[PDB]
Write an enzyme that holds these catalytic residues in place. Sequence first.
Site, mmCIF file in Angstrom:
data_model
loop_
_atom_site.group_PDB
_atom_site.id
_atom_site.type_symbol
_atom_site.label_atom_id
_atom_site.label_comp_id
_atom_site.label_asym_id
_atom_site.label_seq_id
_atom_site.Cartn_x
_atom_site.Cartn_y
_atom_site.Cartn_z
ATOM 1 N N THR B 40 1.132 -1.329 -0.031
ATOM 2 C CA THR B 40 -0.145 -0.139 -0.291
ATOM 3 C C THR B 40 1.138 1.347 0.246
ATOM 4 O O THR B 40 0.507 1.809 -0.602
ATOM 5 C CB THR B 40 -1.079 0.189 1.328
ATOM 6 O OG1 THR B 40 -1.830 -0.952 1.451
ATOM 7 C CG2 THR B 40 -1.813 0.722 1.681
ATOM 8 N N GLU B 48 1.263 9.146 -5.624
ATOM 9 C CA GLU B 48 2.120 10.475 -5.512
ATOM 10 C C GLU B 48 3.042 10.744 -6.581
ATOM 11 O O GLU B 48 3.388 12.317 -7.011
ATOM 12 C CB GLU B 48 2.959 11.030 -4.108
ATOM 13 C CG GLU B 48 2.467 10.471 -3.006
ATOM 14 C CD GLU B 48 2.910 10.821 -1.984
ATOM 15 O OE1 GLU B 48 3.562 12.165 -1.813
ATOM 16 O OE2 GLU B 48 2.836 9.989 -1.296
ATOM 17 N N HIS B 74 -7.408 0.200 -0.949
ATOM 18 C CA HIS B 74 -6.369 -1.367 -1.356
ATOM 19 C C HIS B 74 -7.626 -2.639 -1.704
ATOM 20 O O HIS B 74 -6.939 -2.894 -0.238
ATOM 21 C CB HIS B 74 -5.852 -1.140 -0.784
ATOM 22 C CG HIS B 74 -4.427 -1.792 -1.313
ATOM 23 N ND1 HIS B 74 -2.809 -2.162 -0.568
ATOM 24 C CD2 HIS B 74 -4.037 -1.938 -2.552
ATOM 25 C CE1 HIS B 74 -2.767 -2.016 -2.670
ATOM 26 N NE2 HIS B 74 -3.215 -2.405 -2.657
#
Lengths: 133, 135
Positions: B40, B48, B74
């Site tokens: 994750t 990002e 997730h």
Amino acid sequence: MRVGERFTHDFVVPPHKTVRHLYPESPEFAEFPEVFATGFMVGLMEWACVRAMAPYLEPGEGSLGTAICVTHTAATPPGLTVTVTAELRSVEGRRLSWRVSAHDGVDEIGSGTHERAVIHLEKFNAKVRQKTP
Amino acid sequence: DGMRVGERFTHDFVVPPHKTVRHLYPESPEFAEFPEVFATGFMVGLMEWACVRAMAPYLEPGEGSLGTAICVTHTAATPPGLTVTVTAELRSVEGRRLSWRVSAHDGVDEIGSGTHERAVIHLEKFNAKVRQKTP
């Protein structure tokens, strides 16, 4: 496992948990400031939760991260200690919800929620074995 | 220019063996036996990275950015060898703060989605602040 159960763990930030170490293959990150990466903080949050729930898992059991919802409100250079606190807020059978929080001894650095699902390890690995290229 | 709300960037990544859970924290005994799936913390960094790439043409020289919030599910696991596609869609710009919708799929499954917020920073000002608290 009980709601309100807290766990706490400490972690001295090494140089190799900065942004550029999260993705060494990224030229775009290569000259980012040398601060603890969000992705590394998330992993630290996950790790606190994994450690707290480990004495409650049966053999053959593991868990997966299913959600992460946190702020990242201050930056941490290497050398500071990051303290993560994880507080169990809900247990819906297989599904666990943690309030997670972190400070670096100078600042609060983030907080929010992390969630996890208990898995049977053998049954899960077979599932990923059968989408592996 | 200025960035346009609704604009999308996508970003592809073959997951290598070294982006699994035990590789995010090699120092973690507790992680060393986790299944070998995309962590994750690595997906978050991939998201990002997508947002940083999209923003780059619009930042002034000496400007950068920091993620200030992440809120993602997730939902499926990804072994090494699959390509993760991250989609970053710009939702809002309010001065120095940008909001993104982030989404990921591994060619087989949707693996996660949610939101990511970043703040534009003056790189050298920020570094000087960071030193003020280095030990």
